[PDB]
Amino acid sequence: AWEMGVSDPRKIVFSAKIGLALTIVALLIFYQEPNPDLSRYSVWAILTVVVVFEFTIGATLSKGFNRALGTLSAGGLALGMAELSTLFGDWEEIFCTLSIFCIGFLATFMKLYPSMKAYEYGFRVFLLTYCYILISGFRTGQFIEVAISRFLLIALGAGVSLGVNMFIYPIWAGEDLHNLVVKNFMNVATSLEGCVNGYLRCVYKGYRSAVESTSQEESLMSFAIWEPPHGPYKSFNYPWKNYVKLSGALKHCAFTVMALHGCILSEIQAPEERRQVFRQELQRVGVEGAKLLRELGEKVKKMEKLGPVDLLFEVHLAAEELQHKIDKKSYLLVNSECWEKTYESASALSLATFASLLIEFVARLQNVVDAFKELSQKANFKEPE
Amino acid sequence: AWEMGVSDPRKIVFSAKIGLALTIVALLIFYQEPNPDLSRYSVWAILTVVVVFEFTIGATLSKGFNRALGTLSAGGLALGMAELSTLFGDWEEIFCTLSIFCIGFLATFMKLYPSMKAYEYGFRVFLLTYCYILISGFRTGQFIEVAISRFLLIALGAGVSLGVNMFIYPIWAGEDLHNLVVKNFMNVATSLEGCVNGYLRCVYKGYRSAVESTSQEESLMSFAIWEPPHGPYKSFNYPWKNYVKLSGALKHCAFTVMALHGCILSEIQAPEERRQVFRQELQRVGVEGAKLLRELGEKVKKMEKLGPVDLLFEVHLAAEELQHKIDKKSYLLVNSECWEKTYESASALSLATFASLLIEFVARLQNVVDAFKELSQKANFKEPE
Numbered sequence: 001a002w003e004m005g006v007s008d009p010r011k012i013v014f015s016a017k018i019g020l021a022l023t024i025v026a027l028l029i030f031y032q033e034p035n036p037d038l039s040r041y042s043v044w045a046i047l048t049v050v051v052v053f054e055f056t057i058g059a060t061l062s063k064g065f066n067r068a069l070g071t072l073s074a075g076g077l078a079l080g081m082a083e084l085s086t087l088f089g090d091w092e093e094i095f096c097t098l099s100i101f102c103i104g105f106l107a108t109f110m111k112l113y114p115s116m117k118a119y120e121y122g123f124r125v126f127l128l129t130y131c132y133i134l135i136s137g138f139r140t141g142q143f144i145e146v147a148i149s150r151f152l153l154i155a156l157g158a159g160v161s162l163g164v165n166m167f168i169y170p171i172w173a174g175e176d177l178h179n180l181v182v183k184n185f186m187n188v189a190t191s192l193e194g195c196v197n198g199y200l201r202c203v204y205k206g207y208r209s210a211v212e213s214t215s216q217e218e219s220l221m222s223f224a225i226w227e228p229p230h231g232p233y234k235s236f237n238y239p240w241k242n243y244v245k246l247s248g249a250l251k252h253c254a255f256t257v258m259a260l261h262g263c264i265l266s267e268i269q270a271p272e273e274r275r276q277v278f279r280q281e282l283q284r285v286g287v288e289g290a291k292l293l294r295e296l297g298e299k300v301k302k303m304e305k306l307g308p309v310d311l312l313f314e315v316h317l318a319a320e321e322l323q324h325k326i327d328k329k330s331y332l333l334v335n336s337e338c339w340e341k342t343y344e345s346a347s348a349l350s351l352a353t354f355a356s357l358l359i360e361f362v363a364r365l366q367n368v369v370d371a372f373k374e375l376s377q378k379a380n381f382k383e384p385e
Numbered sequence: 386a387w388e389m390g391v392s393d394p395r396k397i398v399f400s401a402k403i404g405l406a407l408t409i410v411a412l413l414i415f416y417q418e419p420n421p422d423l424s425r426y427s428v429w430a431i432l433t434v435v436v437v438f439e440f441t442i443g444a445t446l447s448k449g450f451n452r453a454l455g456t457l458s459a460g461g462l463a464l465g466m467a468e469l470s471t472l473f474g475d476w477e478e479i480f481c482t483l484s485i486f487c488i489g490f491l492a493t494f495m496k497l498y499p500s501m502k503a504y505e506y507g508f509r510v511f512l513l514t515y516c517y518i519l520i521s522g523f524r525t526g527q528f529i530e531v532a533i534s535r536f537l538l539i540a541l542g543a544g545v546s547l548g549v550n551m552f553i554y555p556i557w558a559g560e561d562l563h564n565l566v567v568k569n570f571m572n573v574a575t576s577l578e579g580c581v582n583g584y585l586r587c588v589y590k591g592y593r594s595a596v597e598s599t600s601q602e603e604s605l606m607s608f609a610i611w612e613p614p615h616g617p618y619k620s621f622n623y624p625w626k627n628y629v630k631l632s633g634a635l636k637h638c639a640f641t642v643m644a645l646h647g648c649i650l651s652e653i654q655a656p657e658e659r660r661q662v663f664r665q666e667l668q669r670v671g672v673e674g675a676k677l678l679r680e681l682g683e684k685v686k687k688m689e690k691l692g693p694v695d696l697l698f699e700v701h702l703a704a705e706e707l708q709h710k711i712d713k714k715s716y717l718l719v720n721s722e723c724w725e726k727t728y729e730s731a732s733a734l735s736l737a738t739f740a741s742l743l744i745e746f747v748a749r750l751q752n753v754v755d756a757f758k759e760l761s762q763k764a765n766f767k768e769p770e
C-alpha cells in the first residue's frame with residue numbers, strides 16, 4: 001500500500017528500475033531489430049530480465065554465474081548426445097527418449113540432497129535447456145544454430161539487466177549485515193529491560209530476532225563476498241565473518257534473556273511481597289546491562305575503537321551487590337524449620353532461579369566484549385579520540 | 386548416493402515418475418504428431434511438467450490453481466489492451482511501451498508487500514505472460530489464436546503431470562504431519578533423558594527439531610486440505626487443525642528442556658559432591674517423564690483413545706518426593722551464617738535452579754494431556770480395548 005512505499009521508498013526505486021529495463025528491452029525490439037531472424041526468437045530477451053534481476057548486486061552476480069554455468073553445461077551435453085545419436089541409424093528416437101529419461105532421473109535425484117539444496121534454479125535451468133535443445137532441433141539438424149542464436153539473445157538481456165541495476169542506484173548487500181548487527185544490540189537491550197520491568201511490575205520479537213537470524217546473516221555474507229570495494233569498505237578482503245562471530249556471541253547471551261522471559265510465564269510463581277525486597281539491585285543490573293549493550297551498538301555503528309576505560313566495572317559491581325543482598329536475606333527462600341506444601345517451596349525457589357539467571361546473563365558479556373575487540377582490530381577501526 | 390537411495394526409496398520413486406512423465410511427453414511429441422505443424426509449439430507441453438511436478442499431491446493442486454489464475458489474468462489484460470491501443474493510431478508502440486512500464490511497476494510493487502511472500506511464482510508468471518502475449522503478437526492478427534494454441538498444450542502437460550503424480554504412487558501431506566508429530570514426541574523424550582544423564586555425569590537435535598518446525602506443520606496443514614479422502618482419513622473435513630495444537634503444547638513443554646540444556650552449559654557450576662545428594666529423585670523424575678512422553682507418542686501413532694487410569698500419577702509422586710528432599714538438605718545451597726565469595730554462592734545456588742526447572746517441566750504436562758484428549762475426541766479415535 002501507499003504507506004509501505006512512503007515508509008520504504010527503496011522498493012519504489014527497485015520497481016522503477018525493473019520498469020525502465022523492461023521498457024528499454026521492449027523498445028530495442030519494437031524499433032531497432034531489422035533482422036528478420038531475430039524476430040523469430042526475439043521474445044527471448046524480455047524473459048531474461050524477469051529472472052536475473054535481484055535486489056542486491058551480489059545476489060544477481062552469483063545467481064547469474066550459477067545459471068550461466070548450468071545453461072552452458074546443459075547445452076554442451078545436449079549437443080554432444082545429439083551428435084552421438086546418429087551412429088545408431090533408424091533407432092534415433094529410441095535413444096533420445098532413453099537419454100531424456102536418464103537425464104531427468106539424474107537431474108532430479110541430485111537436487112533432493114541437502115548439501116546441493118538451495119541451488120535448485122540451476123538444476124531447473126539445466127533440465128530445461130537439455131529438454132529444449134534435444135526436442136527442438138531433432139532431425140532438422142539445426143542443433144547448433146538454435147543454440148548460438150538463443151545464447152546470443154539471452155546475453156543481451158542479461159547485460160541490460162545488469163547495467164541498469166549496477167549504475168542507477170545500487171543496493172549493496174554488505175551494508176545490510178552491518179545494519180542488522182547494529183539492530184540486534186538494540187533489540188536485546190530493549191528486551192532485557194522489558195523483561196525486568198515485567199517481572200517487577202505489580203520483548204518477544206526482541207530476542208527472537210537475535211536468536212532467529214543466523215540464516216539471514218549467512219546469506220548476506222554469501223552475497224557480500226561478490227561485491228567490489230566501495231565506500232567505507234576499501235580493502236580487497238573485508239573480514240565479513242567477524243560480524244557473524246559477534247552476532248553469535250550476542251545470541252549466546254540472548255539465550256539467557258529468553259530463559260528469563262520463559263521464567264516470567266511459568267505456572268509456579270512467588271508472592272509479590274517477597275519479590276519487592278530485591279527491586280533495587282535487579283533494576284540497577286538491568287539498567288547497567290542495557291547501557292552497556294547500547295554503548296557497544298553505538299560503537300559498532302560509527303566504526304570506532306574501544307576507549308581506555310573498562311566498560312564492565314559497573315555491571316560487575318552491581319552483580320556483586322546483588323549477590324551480597326541475596327546472601328544477607330537467604331532465609332526467605334528455603335524452609336529452615338525442617339532440617340535433617342510443594343507449591344510454597346517452588347514459589348520460594350523461583351526467586352533464586354530468577355537471580356541465578358540474571359547473574360549468568362551478567363557473566364556472559366566478556367565473550368561479546370572480546371569478539372568486539374577482535375572485530376575492531378581486524379577491521380581497522382579508527383581511534384575514538 | 387546409496388545413503389538415501391537405500392535409506393529413503395521415496396526419492397528414487399519421485400525421480401522415476403518424473404522420468405516416465407518426460408518420456409511420455411517426448412514420445413507423444415515425436416511419434417504421434419504426423420507432421421511438423423507445431424514443431425515449435427510442441428515444447429510448451431514438455432516444459433510445463435518440469436514446473437508442475439511437486440512432492441505432494443496438495444502442493445501440485447494449490448500451485449496449479451495459483452499458476453492458472455496468473456496465466457489467465459495476464460492473458461485477459463493483454464487481450465483487453467491490444468484492442469484499446471488501436472485507438473491511438475499514431476502513438477501505438479509508445480502506448481504499448483507505457484503499458485508495459487506501468488504493469489511491470491505495479492507487479493513489482495505488489496510482489497514485495499510483506500504479506501505476499503510465498504507467491505512470487507504467480508507474479509512472475511503474470512509478468513511473463515503479459516510480456517509474451519504483448520510482444521510476440523504485434524499487428525499480426527494472432528492474439529487470440531496464439532493464446533488458444535499456447536493454452537491447448539499446457540493443459541495436456543498438466544494433465545500428464547497430474548496423472549503420473551497421482552495414479553502411480555501418491556505422497557500425501559496428511560500422512561506426513563502425523564509422522565512429524567510422532568517424531569517430535571520421541572525426540573522430546575530423548576532430549577529430556579539426555580539432559581539429566583549429562584547433568585548427573587561423573588540432546589540438542591531433539592528439542593531443536595521440536596521447537597523450530599512450526600512452519601513445516603503449517604505448510605503441511607495448508608497442503609493437506611486440498612486432498613480427497615483416502616485410507617484411514619475418511620471424512621469430508623478432517624480436523625487437521627487439532628495436530629497443530631498438540632505440537633504447540635509440546636513446544637511449550639520443550640522450552641524447559643531447552644532451558645535445562647542451557648543450564649548444563651553455564652559458566653557457574655555447583656560442586657559434584659553436592660550434586661550427588663539428589664541423584665535418585667532426578668533420575669526417577671526423568672524416567673517417569675520419558676515413559677509418559679513415549680506412551681503418549683505410541684498412543685498417537687496407533688490412533689487410539691486413552692484408557693480409564695490416570696497417566697500422570699507416577700510422575701506426580703516423583704516430583705513430590707524430590708521436593709521433600711530439598712526441604713531436608715536446604716543448608717547445602719544457602720549460607721546460614723550471614724542471616725541478619727560470589728562465585729561460591731552462585732555455584733551453590735545453581736542446583737536449586739536446575740531442580741526448580743525440572744519441577745516446572747513436570748508441572749507443564751497437563752496441557753499436553755488435555756490437547757491429546759481434545760484431538761482424540763474430535764478425530765474419532767477407537768476404544769483402546
Ligand SMILES: CCCCCCCCCCCCCCCCCC(=O)O
Nearest residue numbers: 072075076125128129132147150151
Ligand atoms: C531459467 C530458464 C532457462 C530457460 C532456457 C531455455 C533454453 C535456453 C537455450 C540455451 C541455448 C544456449 C545453450 C548453450 C549452447 C552452446 C553450448 C556449447 O556448445 O558450448
Ligand SMILES: CCCCCCCCCCCCCCCC(=O)O
Nearest residue numbers: 047048051064067068071154155158
Ligand atoms: C530464459 C533464460 C534465463 C536464464 C539464462 C541464464 C542467465 C543469464 C546468464 C548470462 C551469462 C552471461 C555471461 C556471464 C560472464 C560474462 O560476463 O561474460
Ligand SMILES: CCCCCCCCCCCCCCCC(=O)O
Nearest residue numbers: 456457460461514517532533535536
Ligand atoms: C509463459 C507462459 C505464458 C505464455 C502462454 C500464454 C498463453 C495465453 C494465456 C491464456 C490466455 C487467456 C485469455 C483467453 C484465451 C482464450 O480465449 O482461449
Ligand SMILES: CCCCCCCCCC
Nearest residue numbers: 449452453456539540543
Ligand atoms: C507455465 C505456468 C503454469 C501454467 C499452467 C497452470 C496449470 C493449469 C493450466 C490449465
